[PDB]
Symmetry: D4
């Protein structure tokens, strides 16, 4: 019987920037392809700066741990706007950073920016090492731009 909703405006509003789903998909697929080429089996995830996972892809033959790991890696990379390889080394002086929920301070995640600000993280997991995971995440990032 009743209605209707309020419309905000002016300085009550601000805008944020994101990858399109199409771009995030393009990036994630590029990571898998690079891994599949090298005979690796990986899961890939793209997480928005807002915390939401935009894309996930579970590779054929990938380990059952790789899916969530890739997700947490992307989340970690976009949160601090840095490769998870780098972030893992801050734990020497700031070891309780890993106690932050949703994070995995392990190589395989790398950020993507727009106007110098992080908009997404691309996470990979499943390769024999996180550094190799990250190589594929970079390959994922590299189709974006340029």
């Amino acid at each position: 019987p009743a209605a209707a909703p309020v419309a905000a405006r002016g300085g009550e509003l601000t805008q944020s920037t994101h990858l399109t789903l199409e771009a995030a998909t393009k990036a994630a697929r590029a990571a898998v392809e690079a891994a599949e080429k090298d005979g690796r089996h990986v899961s890939v995830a793209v997480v928005d700066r807002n915390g939401n996972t935009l894309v996930t892809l579970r590779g054929d033959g990938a380990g059952p741990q790789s899916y969530d790991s890739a997700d947490r890696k992307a989340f970690t990379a976009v949160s601090w706007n840095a490769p998870t390889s780098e972030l893992a080394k801050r734990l020497a002086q700031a070891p309780t950073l890993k106690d932050i929920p949703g994070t995995l301070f392990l190589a395989g995640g790398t950020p993507v920016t727009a106007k110098g600000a992080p908009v997404a993280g691309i996470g990979v997991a499943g390769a024999p090492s996180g550094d190799l995971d990250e190589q594929y995440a970079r390959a994922g990032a590299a189709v974006l731009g340029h």
Copy 2:
């Protein structure tokens, strides 16, 4: 030893709209004030269209269930861009909607829009009824604009 991150651009990017924290705070505080005036004790929550909770306020004397309820109500209102009072009545023909995670199909949540699109939900819980919760949520929405 290594760096650096990729910059996306062009049609790989899109923008989204949100309430400012200041506006969301202003709205949430307005809901409490309206409840406090009528002698009610409530929790209030503002949830962004992206799913993230932007503001929560636990009223003095509020029930221990009101906090999470207000959060889920705001989440529900912004998800379907409608008052939770209305959404609760769709359950007659679509009863499994309540089985959607994060939702609470109970009066007390109302949406806020920008350019005809939902950007936030304002949720309230603690009053003797959800319809009264919603009155205060509307009072919260009403300071935005106009």
Copy 3:
């Protein structure tokens, strides 16, 4: 200092069948495209018969509830090898089916088979109704085969 692992064989082993990640991706992308064409904003998920999510895609402008909903819908469809639209109607005589963990008995999920057995479920959420979600899930399934 020590090793190594045991190798099973013979009737101790059996094989299972799955969609490739490439096929699951192709299907999920087809669902989004069909929704985007009709101006809808949806999340899509492909879940393997083994319970594992293989692909997720969060549409631009999709509701924050759509992601997990699509996942649970695909899981539900592949578990019972039936559209979630159909499964929702069994609740009249079997109402406690919805109490099964991981399920969402709501239109939007449809199964994919191999040799008459379910191998994947395709789930969609975000459209004004689950029946419309399911139309797009069918469009997703339809690029597979034929």
Copy 4:
């Protein structure tokens, strides 16, 4: 048909002390303002000594990890009545303290007292370091009193 509830009294009862929602809000808003001034993007949380979160504010541009981190920091500070910067250093001799649920032994949380007893913790997260988070949490505490 039936009623009614029992009323306790005398030495069966005791009283506890808390910040008002208005005071907790005032403090949390003061932390954001101090961060916003220095160009930082942070989430802020005020947690009661009873464990309940009273206020949360998610700053514009804040990292998606900052919200829960600020909450756990405030919880940690009020639990031990000490800055989380200090508490993080006890881990050298008591490293399993971090294994306590709900805690984050990382700078950014500081306690607030009443009659020499902790009543609230103020947590901040999002700045380049926890020590800087804590500076803003102190600014939040500083509007209370004096």
Copy 5:
């Protein structure tokens, strides 16, 4: 190297009222004793108005479901300041109340007050029916006062 914490005062503070642990224990033990006398095997819980569980007792021979049930019942009773037997009947007109987290709208929980305000809920579970659970919860409440 650094310190120290802020002290709040005046109208920045408010007081709340609670059962003592001794009183809550006395009540919970009285419920068990009444059940044990009638040959029943039950779990008992006392939950504070702030949401925190103060006391739990798992009866010998009690069902493995009774512990958490008693907890949720006490939480539900103190949240709405009413017997869970009564609250269960509001579901006819307000069926989505049960969707509130932490609740169990089933007989066995009854509130305890101080100055006309709820301070605790006493929950019982394990007897052949919730109405019988509630009888024992009332016996628990009855040693308080009078």
Copy 6:
């Protein structure tokens, strides 16, 4: 440097009764065999009266929902010492029983007793119906005794 632990005795102690792991395994395997014979694919679970799961078996080709369902069914059957087929029908007059954590009021679970008291529940899930699940659970129970 320090020790040692206290030894309780007398009326401070009581004994409880359980199925052996060997018996629970024998029963669970008998359920699978009966299902496999009829061409059904099911998961089976044996849960102790204390709430602990003693045995689980995931059938080949079983649905991904069957594992947890069988567990919750066994838990439900041993909690109320009755078939879940029967317990599902109490929901007409006691519909909030399903809101008890850990439960699934759906046919497929049946209790096992010792000295007239429940000691275990045997749960099955995966067949086209819960009544058929329960037939196999009974076959599981039937190898015990007699």
Copy 7:
């Protein structure tokens, strides 16, 4: 229409030993009393060897972290049949023990035995140190026997 349940017997059954609820309560209350005497504010928990929590008591003024900590400490002590003070020191050579779910390798938990086998753990948390927590847990254990 149908019934009835199977009765196991013989070597299909085994018996286990436990503290009575009365004994567990007596012990937990003794721990609080010893802490209250020394002016400490603590939560206490008694956990059965089967994993189930039998008793919890939240002290007046206790920290909001103490409740769950005491529970995990009791669980840890009864799992390994040793003081958590001792168990914390095994982490030097076996550091991944803390990664076991439900555990907290921190002083405050001590086991109780029957016939040389663990039957319960008594956990305490809230004092300025775990060693002091454990002193009170020992006082709790000491009223049992002798």
Copy 8:
């Protein structure tokens, strides 16, 4: 009124390999028997390479922590195709591996292969040490083949 589902084929499909439930059961039972012989009380788990737990067995007298530990150990062993004893030692150079969800880098888990690829992990927990747990897991693996 509507139907029916799509059938995938060709290169849209791939096959995976698994232990049969019968083989997994045979292995798990062999581990228990070897432990029971040496007077040890353990829980055993077999987890598929896809992440799903196929078999669990809770030994008589086993610690309440052993069940989940064995599960996580099997999951960890099959994820990296290596004994958890070995994997625990990678933490020296890759310490954040333990932060991967679902894992427990502690001796007691060993992999089983088919065609040089991991298909299952066998996990054991409860013995005085993980190395001894692993001995029994190997005994479990050893009945498979040869």
